Amino acid sequence: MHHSSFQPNNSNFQRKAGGRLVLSTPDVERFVILGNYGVKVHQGEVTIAGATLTPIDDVQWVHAPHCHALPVLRTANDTVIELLPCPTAQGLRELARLNPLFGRLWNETSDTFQIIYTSADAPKRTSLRELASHPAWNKKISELLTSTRRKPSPILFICGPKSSGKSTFGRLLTNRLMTDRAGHKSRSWKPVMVLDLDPGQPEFSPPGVVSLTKLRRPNLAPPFCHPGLSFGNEGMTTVRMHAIASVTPALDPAHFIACARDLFAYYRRSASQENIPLVVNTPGWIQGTGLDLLAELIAVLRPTEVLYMSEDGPEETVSALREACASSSTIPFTMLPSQPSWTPATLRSMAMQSYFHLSPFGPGCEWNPTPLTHLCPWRVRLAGRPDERGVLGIVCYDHQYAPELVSDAINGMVMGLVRIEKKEALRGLAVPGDTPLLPLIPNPTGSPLSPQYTSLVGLVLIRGVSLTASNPELHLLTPVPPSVLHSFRGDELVLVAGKFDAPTWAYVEGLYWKSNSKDEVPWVEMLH
Amino acid sequence: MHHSSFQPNNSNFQRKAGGRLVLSTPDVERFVILGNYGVKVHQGEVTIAGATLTPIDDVQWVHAPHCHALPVLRTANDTVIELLPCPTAQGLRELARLNPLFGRLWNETSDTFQIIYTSADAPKRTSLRELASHPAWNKKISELLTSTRRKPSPILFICGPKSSGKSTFGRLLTNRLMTDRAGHKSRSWKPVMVLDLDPGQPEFSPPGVVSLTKLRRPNLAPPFCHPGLSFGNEGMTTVRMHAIASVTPALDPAHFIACARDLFAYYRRSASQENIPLVVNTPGWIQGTGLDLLAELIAVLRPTEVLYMSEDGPEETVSALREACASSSTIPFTMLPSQPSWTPATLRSMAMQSYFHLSPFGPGCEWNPTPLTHLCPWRVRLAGRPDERGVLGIVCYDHQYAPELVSDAINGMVMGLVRIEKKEALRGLAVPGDTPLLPLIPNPTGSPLSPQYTSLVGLVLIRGVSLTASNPELHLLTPVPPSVLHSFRGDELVLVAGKFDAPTWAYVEGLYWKSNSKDEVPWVEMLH
Amino acid sequence: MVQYIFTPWRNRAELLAVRAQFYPEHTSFQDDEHIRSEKQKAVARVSMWMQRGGCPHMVESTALLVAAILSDEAQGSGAAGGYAVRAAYSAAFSRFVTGLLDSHQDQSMYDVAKAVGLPAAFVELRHQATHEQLPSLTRLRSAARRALEWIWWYYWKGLGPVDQSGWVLYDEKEWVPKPIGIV
Amino acid sequence: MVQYIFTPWRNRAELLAVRAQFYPEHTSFQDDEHIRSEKQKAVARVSMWMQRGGCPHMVESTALLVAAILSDEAQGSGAAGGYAVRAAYSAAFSRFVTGLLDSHQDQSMYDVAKAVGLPAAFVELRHQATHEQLPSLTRLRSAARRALEWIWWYYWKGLGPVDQSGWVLYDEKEWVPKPIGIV
Ligand SMILES: Nc1ncnc2c1ncn2[C@@H]1O[C@H](COP(=O)(O)OP(=O)(O)OP(O)(O)=S)[C@@H](O)[C@H]1O
Ligand SMILES: Nc1ncnc2c1ncn2[C@@H]1O[C@H](COP(=O)(O)OP(=O)(O)OP(O)(O)=S)[C@@H](O)[C@H]1O
Ligand SMILES: [Mg+2]
Ligand SMILES: [Mg+2]
Question: Which residues form a coiled coil (chains C, D) (predicted)?
Fold first, then answer.
């Protein structure tokens, strides 16, 4: 009842009841909880990775994956906290049976969340990092906050070299802006919008998609813990998405910028009514094409403040950025430190797999552990007319394909359902009609469908094309709930096929489940 | 009459008579003459760049171009030397009116040869080097010499990295073997054969030709002072030549080796009778293709002794060579030092131009200063039959050509007259017959004409193709004397066109002569 | 269970089939046309594989070389006019050599080449092609042919011996679990 | 008198002629055939120049690009089957970029590029082409076109405005001295 330890620190009466923990603290004390838990400040005030919770607040669920930096919790004078066990976490845990990578990512104890004490936890291969922060970061955030409180909805543009802290900083900034409650009698929470323009390792969307998200609650979880927010009191909702079909925006810069314009446009419309700050995080390019892109982005958006997380970056990139910034005649440009294993590739892959296992519908988002193979696929028709077919055709990005090959190439990959809003989209393509072959929409140029008239409606994994009968059909499985799928008349719905990085995890998944619980699997060569 | 000076040294009675110098020396003394001169040891013994002259010897002409290292002359106890002025040198000198490069290459005084005294000579931009030699070099040479005197005709293979001393060493070795006269009562001079397998900067042939030369007199002059020895008491004669048509043997290794075989074969035949050592100098490659070539050459020739002029060469080349050497089960492999402006390109060019100005007849070879433009060309017919035409056709190496282009491409370049010995050469080509167009012999493969049945008969410079009439003809000018040209029936004579490095000097030559003595010159763009 | 290697081709038969198409001679007017046709189909197939993701470097190299060769010996208003062919060849060689050297690296170009067993000629040809004056058609032709034979020894020969009814939820009473891809 | 520059082309008219053939649009069914034919002849001519020795790098680059473009849009059993075209394009770009960067050098690739004025896109495309997975046909096509226009601005536009009687010794009484080449 006085637990003291290097990483964490002192405490007081620790009352275990029904599976939850009621812990009292009479003095400033820091904890480092690990796992899945819920916080509900009973009395006093606590800070969690940028947010501040007081007695008048709802339960906040926190996911602390052993991968990233465990959020630190700091409690202030005369406080009583109640730590609840998260329910939906159980489903996520079971995902370890479908991929060993998801196994070592939480506490290997009994309960759902385990406290730590310098080393009494953190099983083998600990590598247990911790979320820290230079005083500079905090000071700058404070400045931005106070300035905001006396002006309209600011726009903060965050950029910098790879592995610099752009994401983490964004996280802190967002939470602070939302939760601040400086002194205007809590005004409970100011909504906040996040514009994600990073196809590489996205936040609030599966890899390969750009999007605009609206947050009502603090963001206290990694990307692979909510990669598919509900489409359409609604803690996090997605306003619009666009498919780039590549893990590198260096395949069609024009398209990338066009997407940025459309999304920002929507933000403008929404902002016009209620004041809502926008936080945008850019990719991680600082030379060549990328640098040019950044310059253009700054010009288009006209960000109020540009934050470069380097402080020792190459003179070339810094100079270029400063010039672009100067051009819009008035934009503050500041620099911050950086503070510099799970490689980006694996992390990205995890995001994708998590997305596909998202259940079609508390607190967050439930998960379904049943392997993809077992699930029943969606049977789409490929023989009729553009009113009794379902899919209007298949378009290819950045690369064509001979007719015959298409069947084999498409099969097994990830594609995107794109909904046509205005017919002024396919204006310039030989759209197949009544019509056995796949209704391929020839696209000589190669440019992707315009972003002004088309919107992404989630990704699709194809599990088998069988066009050898008198009923051509496609078996595809997606996370999109049936409600949305049925409401589309089939006449406005095309499938986009690009890169996406072949979902290799899918094939193996079945085998893992079968073996763990304890035969010509295409594309998998078993070594024996 | 006691002239003393740092570079040269003491002397005695210096009698000037009729234009020559009779100088007496009562003690070992070294001189460094510059220019063109003739030596005739009256009494005693003198050494000149490797050779030794005694009273029983004929006048020896020495050319000391200011470019290379002036040959040093060392006189022994109680000697009297008579220095004669070279005659034919006058023609060579006048060549300065056709190219400023040939201007600064001798003494800018009155007479033909000027002695030196540390700095009293060597006009502006002196850079006056001097021929030296590590004692190791001399010792090794001595060893080879004594060994030779008790065995048959040795074969010495000299190789090493660029700018190492392969050529200079060869020079010394050749002179010593020839002149030695150890103690067998002078046996006046042993003939010596030199096999030049270096298309780059050749010795005893114009750039781009491989050849076998026979020397009766000591070699005391740079390459551009006898690039076209007489074909067929005959101080230096050429036994056989082959055209490679490139300044780099890296365009058809097979052909290069084939040529080496043929030439060596002839050497074998000649050697069989009279004992005559052979000195072969290879290119300057030590990595990749070149290294492989060297290995093969060692295998084919089976040299008695291999001399690598590096002593610190890369372990790769040295190891490779040692392995190849070991393979023939018994070959001594030794290493020597190296002792490390006129670039190879310019030197090579000079060689070529000198060749073309050679007079049709150490003492040596006369030169004709009249510009090439003024000379009367050889009118060859291109309309008749293979008995009244002259040239049997035009073959291309390593590259084809569309019919139309050929006329323009050939014009102005340097090609080679190849004499067919046995009809088993053009066996595999569509030889044109009776037949306005150039009789082009299509050669799909691209490989050069076999060396077993074809021999080079000097190079040719084309100065104008006019196939627009009722008498197709080619105006070409060469150094080959009329006697040889007429004795060929025209049925066995083809022109080979390869690289050769376009003779740019030719075009300008006319202009220089005209201006110095004091209009749409093709290919020359005058800057004004 | 790290014994899972992913390949772009569905199974093994497909890979062997492609091998057969590329090298008819070893695997074994109208006949010539047939052979050419098959080679073209093989090249296209490999291209697809490349896009799919994950593909042995040797396969890509072989595809490039064969494509170039096919372009070279094409009569009938479309033989690339000589300069294009030389470019295709140069590109193929550059990619092939760069791949091999990059793979077996921890030295110099020639040293690594010798270690692998790659005839120095190829390294030289690559270097020359990149920096100065693309080589002549004849050299490229012969070199490409040799390259193919070498690749055969190094890789291919070891792969085996030589002999609103638009969306209807699938009936939860007729479905049977089966690997992703099979139907 | 070091004011002598040597060129592979005989005079100036020939160079201008080649320029005209390459860029009909700026210099200005049957017409299309004519234009294509002329372009082919120009490419061949440049090839000859290259062999002759001494040739502005820009000319060689232009020739390569045009040759590739011609190969791409050739119908009639000989359109290279798609992979060859992509190779020709890659080779052309590699040579072009390598030349420009190498020339204006004393830095980094991108730095030199920026200094010269070469859009970074080209540098990136080159790098990608050499090391990994030759780019897609569409990108190469558009890039090549842009490259040509740029080259036009950088070089071509400045070259001028835009509007046993077998061997008989020649009679030493009828010959008149005249430059090597003229007849
Ligand atoms: N102050 C800090 N406190 C805790 N972790 C930090 C801190 N600074 C950096 N890190 C670590 O740095 C890593 C990268 O953090 P990010 O914010 O994702 O950087 P990033 O620039 O977004 O990386 P990319 O380019 O997006 S892959 C994380 O794993 C963090 O654990
Ligand atoms: N001992 C020496 N005495 C005088 N000059 C020397 C000596 N050693 C080297 N040199 C100079 O070195 C230069 C090169 O001499 P070479 O014998 O031609 O070397 P090389 O290996 O034949 O050069 P390459 O490869 O053929 S161009 C000459 O200009 C000589 O003046
Ligand atoms: Mg990030
Ligand atoms: Mg030499």
Answer: none
H-run or E-run covering B201: none
Q: Which amino acid is at B208?
A: G
Indicate if A264 and A291 belong to the same structural domain: yes
B133 lines ligand 2 (CB under 6 A): yes
Query: Of all helices (H) and strands (E), which one includes residue C174?
Result: none
Say if residue A227 is in the same domain as residue A353: yes
Residue A443 included in any domain: no
For a mutational test of ligand 2's pocket, the pick from B7, B67, B167, i.e. the residue with the most ligand atoms closer than 8 A to its C-beta, is B167
Dig out the tokens for A472 from the structure.
Answer: 């051509």
Q: Please classify residue A401 by burial: count the beta carbons closer than 10 Å to its beta carbon, then call 0-12 exposed, 13-18 middle and 19+ buried.
A: buried
Q: Which class for A182: exposed (0-12), middle (13-18), buried (19 or more C-beta within 10 A)?
A: exposed
How many angstroms from the chain centroid is the CA of residue D22? 9
Residue D21, CA distances (Å) to A177, B346, B392, D13 in order: 64, 37, 36, 12
In this structure, is residue A515 part of a structural domain? no
Q: Distance, CA D4 to ligand 4 centroid (Å)?
A: 29
> In sequence order, which residues have a C-beta less than 8 Å from that of residue C32 and are 6 or more positions away?
none
Same domain? For A303 and A401 the reply is: no
Contact between residue B72 and residue B130 where contact means Cβ atoms under 8 Å apart: yes
Q: Does residue A524 lie within any of the structural domains? A: no
| Rounded Cα–Cα distance for residues C156 and C56 (Å) | 11
Q: Note the helical H segments in A164-288.
A: 166-179, 253-271
Domain that holds residue B73: 1-132
Half-sphere exposure of A19 (CA within 13 A, CB side): 10
Q: How far from each other are the two terminal CA atoms of chain B, in whole angstroms?
A: 55
Mind giving me the DSSP string for B456-480?
Answer: EEEEEEEEEEE-SSSS-EEEEE-SS
Pairing of strands B454-466, B378-381: unpaired
Give the gyration radius of chain D's Cα atoms.
21
- Report how far residue D85's alpha carbon sits from residue C84's, in angstroms, rounded to the nearest whole number: 8
Q: How far apart, in Å, do the first and last CA atoms of chain A sit?
A: 55
Number of domains in chain B: 3
Could you say which residues from 21 to 50 on chain C have a Cβ atom under 8 Å away from some Cβ of chain A? 44-45, 48
Any idea what DSSP says for residue B420? E
3-class secondary structure for B134-157?
Answer: CHHHHHHHHHHHHHHCCCCCCEEE
User: Chains with ≥3 Cβ pairs under 8 A against C?
Assistant: A, B, D
Going from the C-alpha of D138 to that of each of A213, A397, C68, D75, the distances in angstroms are 33, 10, 19, 18
Own/partner pairs for A142-146, CB < 8 Å, 24+ apart?
Answer: A144/A173, A144/A305, A145/A176, A145/A177, A145/A180, A145/A182
Torsion of CA D118, D121, D125, D128, to 10 degrees: 120
Phi-psi category of residue D175: left, alpha or beta, with phi > 0 → left and psi -120 to 50 → alpha = beta
Terminal-to-terminal C-alpha distance of chain D: 27
Residues B159 and B256 in one domain: yes
Domain membership flag for residue B509? no
Of A454, A444, A452, A435, the C-alpha closest to A494 is A454
Q: Give the integer Cα–Cα distance in Å for C25 and C35.
A: 10
Q: A55: which 2 tokens?
A: 């007695």
Nearest to D179 among B389, B391, B522 (CB): B522
Residue of chain D minimizing CA distance to C40: D81
B127 shares its domain with B142:
no
CB-count burial class (<10 Å; 0-12, 13-18, 19+) for C57: middle
How far apart (Å, rounded) are the C-alpha atoms in residues B441 and B453? Answer: 17
Please tell me what resolution, in angstroms, this structure has. 2.9
Taken as a whole, chain C contains a residue count of 183
Shared domain check, A236 and A347: yes
